[PDB]
Amino acid sequence: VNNPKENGPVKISSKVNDKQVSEFLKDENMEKFNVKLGTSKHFYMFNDNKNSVAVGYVGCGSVADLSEADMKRVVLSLVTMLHDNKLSKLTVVFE
Amino acid sequence: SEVPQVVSLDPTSIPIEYNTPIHDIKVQVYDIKGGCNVEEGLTIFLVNNPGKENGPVKISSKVNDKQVSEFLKDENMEKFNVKLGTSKHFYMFNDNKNSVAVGYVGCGSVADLSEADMKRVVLSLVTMLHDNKLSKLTVVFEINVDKNLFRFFLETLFYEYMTDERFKSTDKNVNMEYIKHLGVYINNADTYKEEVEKARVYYFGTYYASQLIAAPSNYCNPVSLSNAAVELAQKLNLEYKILGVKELEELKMGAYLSVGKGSMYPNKFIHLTYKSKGDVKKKIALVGKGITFDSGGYNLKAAPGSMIDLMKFDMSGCAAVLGCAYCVGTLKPENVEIHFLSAVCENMVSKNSYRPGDIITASNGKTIEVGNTDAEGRLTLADALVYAEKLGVDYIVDIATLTGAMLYSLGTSYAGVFGNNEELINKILQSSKTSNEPVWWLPIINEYRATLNSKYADINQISSSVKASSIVASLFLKEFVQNTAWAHIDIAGVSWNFKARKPKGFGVRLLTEFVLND
Amino acid sequence: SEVPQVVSLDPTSIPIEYNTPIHDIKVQVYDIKGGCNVEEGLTIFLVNNPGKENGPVKISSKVNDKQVSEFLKDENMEKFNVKLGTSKHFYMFNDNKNSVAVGYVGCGSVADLSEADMKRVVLSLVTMLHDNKLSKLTVVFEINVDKNLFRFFLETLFYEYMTDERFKSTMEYIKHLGVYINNADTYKEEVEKARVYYFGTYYASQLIAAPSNYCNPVSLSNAAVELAQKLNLEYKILGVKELEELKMGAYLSVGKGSMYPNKFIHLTYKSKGDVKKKIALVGKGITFDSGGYNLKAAPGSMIDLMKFDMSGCAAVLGCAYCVGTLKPENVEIHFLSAVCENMVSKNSYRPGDIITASNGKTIEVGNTDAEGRLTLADALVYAEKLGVDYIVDIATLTGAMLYSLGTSYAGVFGNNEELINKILQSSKTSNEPVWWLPIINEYRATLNSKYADINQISSSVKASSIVASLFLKEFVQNTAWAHIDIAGVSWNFKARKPKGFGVRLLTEFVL
Amino acid sequence: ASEVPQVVSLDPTSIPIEYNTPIHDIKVQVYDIKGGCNVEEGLTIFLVNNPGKENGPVKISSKVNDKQVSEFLKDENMEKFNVKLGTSKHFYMFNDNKNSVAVGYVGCGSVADLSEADMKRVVLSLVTMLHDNKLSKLTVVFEINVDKNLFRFFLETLFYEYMTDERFKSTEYIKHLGVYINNADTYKEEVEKARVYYFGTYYASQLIAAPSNYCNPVSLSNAAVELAQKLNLEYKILGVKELEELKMGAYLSVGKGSMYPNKFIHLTYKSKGDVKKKIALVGKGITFDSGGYNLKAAPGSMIDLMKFDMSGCAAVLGCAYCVGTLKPENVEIHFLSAVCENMVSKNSYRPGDIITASNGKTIEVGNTDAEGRLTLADALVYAEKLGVDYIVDIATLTGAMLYSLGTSYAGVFGNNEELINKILQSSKTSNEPVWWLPIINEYRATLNSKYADINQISSSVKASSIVASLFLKEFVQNTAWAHIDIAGVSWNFKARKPKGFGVRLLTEFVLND
Numbered sequence A: 001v002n003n004p005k006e007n008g009p010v011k012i013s014s015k016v017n018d019k020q021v022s023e024f025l026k027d028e029n030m031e032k033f034n035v036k037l038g039t040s041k042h043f044y045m046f047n048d049n050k051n052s053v054a055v056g057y058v059g060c061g062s063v064a065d066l067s068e069a070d071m072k073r074v075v076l077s078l079v080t081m082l083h084d085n086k087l088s089k090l091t092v093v094f095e
Numbered sequence B: 001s002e003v004p005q006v007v008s009l010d011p012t013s014i015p016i017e018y019n020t021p022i023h024d025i026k027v028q029v030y031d032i033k034g035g036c037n038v039e040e041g042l043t044i045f046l047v048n049n050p051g052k053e054n055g056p057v058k059i060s061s062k063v064n065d066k067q068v069s070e071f072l073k074d075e076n077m078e079k080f081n082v083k084l085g086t087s088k089h090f091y092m093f094n095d096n097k098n099s100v101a102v103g104y105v106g107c108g109s110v111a112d113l114s115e116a117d118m119k120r121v122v123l124s125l126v127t128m129l130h131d132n133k134l135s136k137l138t139v140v141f142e143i144n145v146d147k148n149l150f151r152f153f154l155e156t157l158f159y160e161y162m163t164d165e166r167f168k169s170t171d172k173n174v175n176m177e178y179i180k181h182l183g184v185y186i187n188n189a190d191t192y193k194e195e196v197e198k199a200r201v202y203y204f205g206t207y208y209a210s211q212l213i214a215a216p217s218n219y220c221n222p223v224s225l226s227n228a229a230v231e232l233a234q235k236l237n238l239e240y241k242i243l244g245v246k247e248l249e250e251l252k253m254g255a256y257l258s259v260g261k262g263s264m265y266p267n268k269f270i271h272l273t274y275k276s277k278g279d280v281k282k283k284i285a286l287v288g289k290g291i292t293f294d295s296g297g298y299n300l301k302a303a304p305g306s307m308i309d310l311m312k313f314d315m316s317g318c319a320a321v322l323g324c325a326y327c328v329g330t331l332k333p334e335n336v337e338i339h340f341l342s343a344v345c346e347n348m349v350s351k352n353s354y355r356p357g358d359i360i361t362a363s364n365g366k367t368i369e370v371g372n373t374d375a376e377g378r379l380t381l382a383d384a385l386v387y388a389e390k391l392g393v394d395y396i397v398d399i400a401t402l403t404g405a406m407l408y409s410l411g412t413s414y415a416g417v418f419g420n421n422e423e424l425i426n427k428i429l430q431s432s433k434t435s436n437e438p439v440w441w442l443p444i445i446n447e448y449r450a451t452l453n454s455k456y457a458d459i460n461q462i463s464s465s466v467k468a469s470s471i472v473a474s475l476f477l478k479e480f481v482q483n484t485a486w487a488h489i490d491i492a493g494v495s496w497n498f499k500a501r502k503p504k505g506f507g508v509r510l511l512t513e514f515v516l517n518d
Numbered sequence C: 001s002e003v004p005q006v007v008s009l010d011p012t013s014i015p016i017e018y019n020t021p022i023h024d025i026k027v028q029v030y031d032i033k034g035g036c037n038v039e040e041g042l043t044i045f046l047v048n049n050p051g052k053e054n055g056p057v058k059i060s061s062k063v064n065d066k067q068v069s070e071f072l073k074d075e076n077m078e079k080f081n082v083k084l085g086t087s088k089h090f091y092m093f094n095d096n097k098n099s100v101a102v103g104y105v106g107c108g109s110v111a112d113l114s115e116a117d118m119k120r121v122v123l124s125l126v127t128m129l130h131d132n133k134l135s136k137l138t139v140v141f142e143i144n145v146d147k148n149l150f151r152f153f154l155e156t157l158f159y160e161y162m163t164d165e166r167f168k169s170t171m172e173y174i175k176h177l178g179v180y181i182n183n184a185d186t187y188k189e190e191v192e193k194a195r196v197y198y199f200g201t202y203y204a205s206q207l208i209a210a211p212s213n214y215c216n217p218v219s220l221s222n223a224a225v226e227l228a229q230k231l232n233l234e235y236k237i238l239g240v241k242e243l244e245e246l247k248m249g250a251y252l253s254v255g256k257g258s259m260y261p262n263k264f265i266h267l268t269y270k271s272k273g274d275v276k277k278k279i280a281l282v283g284k285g286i287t288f289d290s291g292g293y294n295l296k297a298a299p300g301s302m303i304d305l306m307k308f309d310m311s312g313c314a315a316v317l318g319c320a321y322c323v324g325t326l327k328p329e330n331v332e333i334h335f336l337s338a339v340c341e342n343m344v345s346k347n348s349y350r351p352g353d354i355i356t357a358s359n360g361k362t363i364e365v366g367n368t369d370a371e372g373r374l375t376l377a378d379a380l381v382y383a384e385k386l387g388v389d390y391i392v393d394i395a396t397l398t399g400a401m402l403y404s405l406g407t408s409y410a411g412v413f414g415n416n417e418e419l420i421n422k423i424l425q426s427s428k429t430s431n432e433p434v435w436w437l438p439i440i441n442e443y444r445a446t447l448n449s450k451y452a453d454i455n456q457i458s459s460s461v462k463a464s465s466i467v468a469s470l471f472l473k474e475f476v477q478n479t480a481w482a483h484i485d486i487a488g489v490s491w492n493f494k495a496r497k498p499k500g501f502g503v504r505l506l507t508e509f510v511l
Numbered sequence D: 001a002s003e004v005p006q007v008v009s010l011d012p013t014s015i016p017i018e019y020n021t022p023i024h025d026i027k028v029q030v031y032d033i034k035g036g037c038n039v040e041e042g043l044t045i046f047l048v049n050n051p052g053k054e055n056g057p058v059k060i061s062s063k064v065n066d067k068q069v070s071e072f073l074k075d076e077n078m079e080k081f082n083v084k085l086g087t088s089k090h091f092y093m094f095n096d097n098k099n100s101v102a103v104g105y106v107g108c109g110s111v112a113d114l115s116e117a118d119m120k121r122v123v124l125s126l127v128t129m130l131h132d133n134k135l136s137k138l139t140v141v142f143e144i145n146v147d148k149n150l151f152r153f154f155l156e157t158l159f160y161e162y163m164t165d166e167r168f169k170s171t172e173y174i175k176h177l178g179v180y181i182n183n184a185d186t187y188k189e190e191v192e193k194a195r196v197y198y199f200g201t202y203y204a205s206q207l208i209a210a211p212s213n214y215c216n217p218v219s220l221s222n223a224a225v226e227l228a229q230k231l232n233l234e235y236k237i238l239g240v241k242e243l244e245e246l247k248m249g250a251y252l253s254v255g256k257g258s259m260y261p262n263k264f265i266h267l268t269y270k271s272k273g274d275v276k277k278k279i280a281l282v283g284k285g286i287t288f289d290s291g292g293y294n295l296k297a298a299p300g301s302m303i304d305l306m307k308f309d310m311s312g313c314a315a316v317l318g319c320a321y322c323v324g325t326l327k328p329e330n331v332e333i334h335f336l337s338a339v340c341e342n343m344v345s346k347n348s349y350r351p352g353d354i355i356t357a358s359n360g361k362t363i364e365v366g367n368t369d370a371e372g373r374l375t376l377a378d379a380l381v382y383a384e385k386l387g388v389d390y391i392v393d394i395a396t397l398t399g400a401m402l403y404s405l406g407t408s409y410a411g412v413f414g415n416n417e418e419l420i421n422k423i424l425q426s427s428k429t430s431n432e433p434v435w436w437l438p439i440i441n442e443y444r445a446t447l448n449s450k451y452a453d454i455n456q457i458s459s460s461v462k463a464s465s466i467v468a469s470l471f472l473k474e475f476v477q478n479t480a481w482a483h484i485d486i487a488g489v490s491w492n493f494k495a496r497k498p499k500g501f502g503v504r505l506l507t508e509f510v511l512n513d
């Protein structure tokens, strides 16, 4: 996620086919986080099927067009969660 | 009192923040043997697993919520581990179908956390506070810690949580929202309650010193530093006295005055005094090195690795002593009389500066041959130590960023302590343990004394041969304490936090515990 | 206005020579069609040989003299070659039974001479002028050069011919210059443009070469006022009191340790027509760079050269002369320079000091020797408030240029693709070489200060020229801006003198 | 004994060693000062002080059974001299028997109790008179108060400083030493122990002072075997083939660029009694430290001194002599040293090279000049495999020691408080000053390598001495271990000679443990 402004709030636009996760991604909950390039937050919670899921975001700054360096900082933030989590699957949503 | 300027845009005072967001935090401590309530903000569990390294997470505390207790069940938590520093955030709904945030911080597999270990735990906690707009934080202790470590928890938490933005103009932080409430669940909570407000005072004493050190040399000078000390004494109600150049000339402090000759700022000797209302027992003088900027003088810091842009911290000792003044003046210990001393000046390059080779006379009559203008600290301390002993005190303790050699001896974590009295040193070491500011005892090797033998003056400022700068410097200072128990703490290596790019305020809690446990 | 002194023997003004020996040279341009006349003075033929490396000399021009023509016959000249830089002198009698001096300079084997080649040609020619007492020089172009290269010939010739003796205690320049070329009519207008471009370059050269005890913040601003008066540019010199009013804390901080008060130079040229582009030219004006408490004591710091640290200011002022003389239309130009001195004193600013710029941004000083970007910062803010279309700064900012482009090419940075392109063409037509260097944003994070809004310098990144450019970019909010780093090209180390680099480049930019 | 390789025939193939020294020929007699002093033969020196009155006048209190000398020592004559520490005077005259005798004094200051350093200055002043006199007998009169250890320290320092090494020179000594002191009978037993401690120290001195062309891995190992044979110690010298089998890759890597093969020294002393405590003494044995490809080219790197980089091994061998001579009971001691040479060659190891120790730990080399800890690593692993109770290593490891304790005090690190206290105790009785330095675990993270198990050095942390200990600690799994860094105290820079530091310290540790 980005915010075209600077250190802006996180806003999720995509529709999520899960009620529990959808409540988490509501503007009020996500507005407490900012889009500073590289900043990230992830939470563990139960979805509609009472299954354990981890959800989060990675800040992509205030610029609409990310550079190679910008994308590099984004990927590294992502890898940090992968290295600190015993996950079976990673899902990335490009907003 | 009036700060001299070169241009009208030059600052005439050090900006100081007294009322910090931390002081607005309402802190409540509950006993864990009653269960935990989860409602507002983030609730963090401090959890370990003794023996089983990177062990699984197990929540032992009773949670006064059915939904949260089921969430926190062992079956759920077993995929997470207690690796020291590790942390995770949880999202869930409570019994009232309300959204609550829960998480933990790994405290490792060892039962007894060290000063460094607890420090790492607190840092993980602060990361959770950062980038999140929380109104209330609640910490649940599922580990065993004593009162000192618990207090150390709060001190470190408050300090690291706090952000210094005194010098931010247009790069201030628009997401800087601090919590308003701190809840603490612990075992035998009644015993820990008294540590809360002791931590807050210790916090600000440390943060106060941090503010003075971090303040650049154009803001923080001999005049502005002494003025701030006067202001602090007035808010505390301590006797204070600021000696100017004329009084210092009368007192024949030629070593101290020589160092500041090249500065546009007049020398200022800070003298604060705290006297307890009761039969005085121990009388203490705390002496801090107060060089607002160390250019090195004509022995300019031009060599690679000299870190000249850092030398705003050369008054860290003075800052530590003043921070102690706040703590002592606030806690009001009994049966003690404390003198807070610092010979403040600036070591600059000018036509009026003193030269390498110059021979100067100290207030005790001793003549000194200056071999290096960059060894000015011991020179200022020399006249300060003499002044201290004239007060007829029981203990003289100085603290200063004296020798860079400390970085090669003890490094950045442990400070070095020297002295002429075995008993006083142990008090410092003991105070180090209870304050959790690490200090190691270093020897004053008398065999090196001969290298300070000057051909013309009574004594040399520095040695020409010996590379043991910390020991040699201590040998110098000892020549200015005739018949009093004296200790010297060299905090050159531990004063500045290079990784975090900020001061530690090292020495404030150490000295306060020293004054209090005495 | 009044220059402060320590002793009565201290200079109170920069010695400036306006009317130079070059200006007394009568220059005439003739068309080669009709033959070349000699007899008088020294006559030099510029000859090349396309294809052959060190091929034989062949004179192509028709010579209006029987004696000289026979002497200059191919058979006689075939023992000589056209190797670049070569020169020869001939003695003979003309049609009038008079003794005449003739010779040539090799222009190589390439048909199209480059700027460096032509420069090497001029040095060879000037060598003939120095050890010989001539009244007239005659040059015959038997090579192909365009108008720009022709103008460059004259500029370089005039510049190298001229000798600066303002500081000599302890002679006879030519009075006439004749030029034979084809299409003479088209090149005639280039002559006086060369004369002007020459002095603009030479003017700046005098200011740069002038030592810091002669050229100081007060005397330099006075010279600029004097220059504005010999021209007719609006001028205003801001003193410390005005700078305090304008809250220029970065600029004022650098000069705190100096005995000379800060002086902000502001010259303005306004066209007597409907203005189109408004331009601010900003030059670094450090009359001496000691480095401050970050003293230039390290090996290779070259402290004895730091009188040239006002080279940017000199270039801007040199541009002012050409523009004020040539009177371009539809343009309004502001010539700006934050002038001061970076010294060591009890009053100097310190490493670690936090200062406030005029745009409100607070800056943490990590190195007092990086004073240039600090002065430019307040100047760039001052420039942008003028509401201009283009802001271009020129400065001897970073020594790293010596490791990137060397001594021939200057580096240009900017926030506008269009502005950069104008500079590059100006580089081509002015024949002052410039190469486009990138502002790498990934390095910006190194300027993130813990206490101040921004860091003055980087602790890690060694790409100083780019990092410094990142700093300056933080003080141009919404205007096309370019930055020319002339640290490496300002001083001609081999010749022991300044180049006056930037005057012709900026003038071409304005034109 | 292996054959030492040569480049030319003029290259030495063995270390010249002096076993029978003139000191061993000195007859020592101790008399009680209460009975009065006899003056007759040789030079008689009085050790006098003046408590309180600094640089005070000299006053001789002892009664001398000679009229001529007695008039000389009268207060009126001696008061013209002062007791400034190190000051000395001596005159030649005829005694009651018309015999030529020399009498004098050495100033012991205004302090009643001399320190180890102070006593050193006294001996040097004394030795100066011995080097300028062809005397048959020296007599020292103690008019100062000294304990049993300090008296023995007197003799050791006297013997050591008196002795001059002339093995490489070519282009007398007293036969009697008389001592007047109080409670002479109690000090008598210290005499012959001083002689042994003397040679143990001087022996190590011979090894250290010996240049790298004489003292190399082969010649030094041969010397260790010879010493073991003269004492009757079990000995074993491991060659490259055996070292390869034991997988000592760290130790082998440092010596790869040398023309001299690596040699692992293993000496053992076993008591003719029921063994109780088993001890391994490990000394760093770098015959020359050029620094490798990280060449010692920086100013102050003192490359011409790096023949002394085997000072640790020399101390251990010196200890081997003392123990093998004094023959302690209920103890088994292993004297270990992985000896090699750190040179520059096509075969040398490179910065960045990753190597494997005998314990399986892989190491990333960040600086070839940090070769000591690499050799010690494999040595420490070998030691622990012997199944010992105590492991103590001694090495000239870090130059930072010059910035911490200087040239007088050695540094001690460890993983066991009790063992460290023993070393500190050993320091007091041996009078070889040592200070306890901390192993700060917080710095351990700087040794985390990106590719290897562990880093050889830190890139950031400047506490080099502490970082090195953190390194070494990774090669001692479950044994009491202490580490003595003698880099700063090993060489006497002013006197231009080795101290043989550690020999007496280690021997006292072995004897008192």
Ligand SMILES: CC(C)(C)OC(=O)N[C@H](C(=O)NO)c1ccc(-n2cccn2)cc1
Pocket: B294, B296, B306, B307, B372, B374, B375, B376, B377, B378, B401, B402, B403, B404, B407, B462, B469, B492, B493
């Ligand atoms: C006397 C001498 C030359 C051996 O040591 C110093 O000059 N030390 C300087 C100094 O100015 N002491 O007053 C010094 C002190 C501290 C540091 N230091 C650098 C980081 C932390 N401390 C560096 C240099």
Ligand SMILES: CC(C)(C)OC(=O)N[C@H](C(=O)NO)c1ccc(-n2cccn2)cc1
Pocket: C289, C291, C302, C367, C369, C370, C371, C372, C373, C396, C397, C398, C399, C400, C402, C457, C464, C487, C488
């Ligand atoms: C601060 C740093 C290292 C990033 O850049 C400089 O030190 N620049 C200095 C300077 O004084 N800038 O104001 C510098 C160094 C060398 C040159 N220089 C050297 C040859 C030609 N120019 C110019 C400037």
Ligand SMILES: CC(C)(C)OC(=O)N[C@H](C(=O)NO)c1ccc(-n2cccn2)cc1
Pocket: D289, D301, D302, D367, D369, D370, D371, D372, D396, D397, D398, D399, D400, D457, D464, D465, D487, D488
């Ligand atoms: C920081 C480092 C690892 C590069 O250097 C050292 O800590 N010590 C080197 C060394 O490892 N040598 O093998 C060292 C050790 C001793 C000295 N030394 C110099 C005089 C006495 N000792 C100098 C450098």
Ligand SMILES: [Zn+2]
Pocket: B294, B296, B373, B374, B375, B376, B377
């Ligand atoms: Zn200093």
Ligand SMILES: [Zn+2]
Pocket: B291, B294, B314, B374, B376, B377, B401, B402
């Ligand atoms: Zn200092």
Ligand SMILES: [Zn+2]
Pocket: C289, C291, C368, C369, C370, C371, C372
């Ligand atoms: Zn500079």
Ligand SMILES: [Zn+2]
Pocket: C286, C289, C309, C369, C371, C372, C396, C397
């Ligand atoms: Zn500059």
Ligand SMILES: [Zn+2]
Pocket: D289, D291, D368, D369, D370, D371, D372
């Ligand atoms: Zn080495």
Ligand SMILES: [Zn+2]
Pocket: D286, D289, D309, D369, D371, D372, D396, D397
């Ligand atoms: Zn070594």
